């Protein structure tokens, strides 16, 4: 069967994406996990595949699994987000540090990632119309007229998610050991840049759209103030990212 | 902005849906519509009047949800809302009295405590109209405290009193958590209390810091330092208990003290 071929191949992708190698999850295999969700309009074999891995024995393998999960939530078929809701309990179980076991010290990073991913899934449950990177043009195309009162509440939820990303990236930067490169730690910043920029772009477009063309727009000033605060804070994050040679080799850091 | 009569009619629908008997958080877009109304018309009078022809007191969940909605409108509405709220103190008080007791679902004590807190909040804003409803930080308030330390002392004391009200109320809300049910309606009241407590905390911290440099009288401010420390440790515990609530953390960032 070519069906059994497809299942066998995804199993290899998940395995190799979460190997013991202390670096970024192998891109071709993470890419193949993402593609699988689009090809079959289903992520069920992805979640099943991760559950049968020997990933809890090494905290690097657990951390690489969470990076892979994050990327698949971001870029996979929309159903991936829906099917992730049933796996909240399993995702929460990864926040342990049984084996690893703090020789390289990923425990705090694993707990912070699990907290973030559950917060991401909480948002997508509340706001199912979004895709994994909060695309504005995809979001606003689904209806003719959009409620600015829903828009206000949605932005404050996104800003709260932006705060979790900023806390998490700062924790990753603190864990950088001086000599000998931190490629696995730095690789987690790749989807965090994508997440934070996705949020930034949407809030920019939506907050602009909500402003009445003339008048003071007094009601939106709390969002403007928090938007500006998060902008300058995101500039600092992206400046620190642009000075990492390994991170800039993987992605283009947004300007802002 | 629409026709006045038609605008009040649409606001009535928002108030109705926000205060429905569904044991949930007040439906957020309708609470937002109530807040936005005050900015659009530069007046909260329609909101207060709209609440008067919305039956809520027969159902404890509706009454508690109404008090959450009132709290959010006081926080985020046009500044005139706080002034116009003063004439509705008697009515807010009436929501608790005509006593029920516990109630079937146990919102009775939470209702009475929310009314108690909201009256204390309005008492503060009457005495101290320089602040806004959400205690959005303004450095100017600490500058006033530098130049008028007698006034600053009294304002810090009153801020601390309001902080104690929030601490007592949040403790009561946590004690009424039930293992059956998502606790969303109860937890949706904690959200504005966390926001308000932090705003108060930032003001107390900055004003008390500013007053030590200006006056140089460590003996006179010692009671405020003693109370500050106590309230700090309480607030850490409050924010710690909130950190494990996933509905709350999805809506607001908990401060790290």
Residue numbers in the entry:
A (entry chain B): 7 to 262
B (entry chain A): 6 to 262
From the paper:
Clathrin-mediated endocytosis is essential for protein retrieval during neurotransmission and receptor recycling. Accumulation of the adapter proteins at the plasma membrane initiates the endocytic event and contributes to membrane bending. Complex formation has been observed between the ENTH domain of epsin and the ANTH domain of Sla2, the yeast homolog of human huntingtin interacting protein 1 related (Hip1R). Epsin and the phospholipid PIP2 are essential for clathrin-mediated endocytosis, and we show how assemblies are formed between the ENTH domain of epsin and the ANTH domain of Sla2 in fungi.
